[PDB]
Design a binder for this molecule. Sequence first.
Ligand code: 2GA
Length: 208
Amino acid sequence: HVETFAFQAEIAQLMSLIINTFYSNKEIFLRELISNSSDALDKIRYESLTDPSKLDSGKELHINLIPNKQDRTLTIVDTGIGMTKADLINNLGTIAKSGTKAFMEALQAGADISMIGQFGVGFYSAYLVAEKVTVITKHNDDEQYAWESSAGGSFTVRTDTGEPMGRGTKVILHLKEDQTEYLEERRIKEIVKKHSQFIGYPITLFVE
Ligand SMILES: CSc1nnc(Sc2c(C)n[nH]c2C)s1
């Protein structure tokens, strides 16, 4: 069954700001998410040097970008460390609470939304373009979960009965009506080249 949770007030607040502030440079969402993926790949690569059995759920360490115009989704997939249930419901939120306070204070002083990644909370930049974000994830010592949120102060988590994914995270961006540009090959490739050219894992851009 589906469990429903309230975001921490500070996170809810950061998400409304992301969603409501006029800010044209939305494309930065892709580097923050690819960056999130790279951090998670680094994590499993490291942890595997002292316990190679952690790669029994898959050896290949990569990132796929998968647009689907029919579904209006852009999907980022990684085979990084994945998330446990406690990560999804509690730990990540707890870590992000100071990232968010800091970021929110910088934002007067005249920092802008593109700096969001320096405060460790870039994942929420998904909300610049996605009306809903669904996240399938699988950590080595835990079950596959689906996390989901359309913002508004709440998120859901259920155990995921769908197709097994080995180990990693899939971020499914259900794009807003006027953000379908991030479904085009040339647009994605441009952004990847501009902001994420030196990521240390293969990034495959799938075509439709
Ligand atoms: C609430 S779901 C979620 N939070 N933070 C992320 S960043 C991340 C990605 C993009 N892959 N793995 C991780 C930990 S995904």
